[PDB]
A paper describes a structure:
Interleukin 4 (IL-4) is a pleiotropic cytokine that plays a major regulatory role in the immune system. Signal transduction of IL-4 is mediated by a sequential binding process, initiated first by binding of IL-4 to its high-affinity single membrane spanning receptor chain IL-4Rα. This intermediate ligand receptor complex then recruits one of two possible low-affinity receptor subunits, the common gamma chain (γc) or the IL-13Rα1 chain, into the functional hetero-trimeric complex to initiate signalling. The overall structure of IL-4 comprises the known four-helical bundle in up-up-down-down topology, which like the crystal packing is unaffected by these mutations.
Residue numbers in the entry: 1 to 129
């Protein structure tokens, strides 16, 4: 369960997300990682999946993000698609939908995703030899 290939699905998706720049990767998410580190793994996954769901729900049809050019629109849709795929894997890992997130700090989506990538890669590393 804990070292399931879902971890690779998440990392693969994050690897793509972090190479993607759009009109709105600087808009913010609640920084779940600004905590002093006091939650179970499932709780961390639930919290990340929660703030990402907020983000894609709020920005999928946001006039600031939708794009003027074909390329801008494509990149927007690709980002939304990937966030939903990432989110779907996170909820699968969390096994939990109820996790309040109380952090004040907002970080850019771009910074959040790089941090979550680091945490996910660290989990993968602790699973393999």
């Amino acid at each position: 369960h804990k070292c399931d290939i879902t971890l690779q699905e998440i990392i693969k998706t994050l690897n793509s997300l972090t190479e993607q720049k759009t009109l709105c990767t600087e808009l913010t998410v609640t920084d779940i990682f600004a905590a002093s580190k006091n939650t179970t793994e499932k709780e961390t996954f639930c919290r990340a999946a929660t703030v990402l769901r907020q983000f894609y729900s709020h920005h999928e049809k946001d006039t600031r993000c939708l794009g003027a050019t074909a390329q801008q629109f494509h990149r927007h849709k690709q980002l939304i698609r990937d966030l939903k795929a990432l989110d779907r894997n996170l909820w699968g890992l969390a096994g939990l939908n109820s996790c309040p997130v109380k952090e004040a700090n907002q970080s850019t989506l771009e910074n959040f995703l790089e941090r979550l990538k680091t945490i996910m890669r660290e989990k993968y590393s602790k699973c393999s030899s």
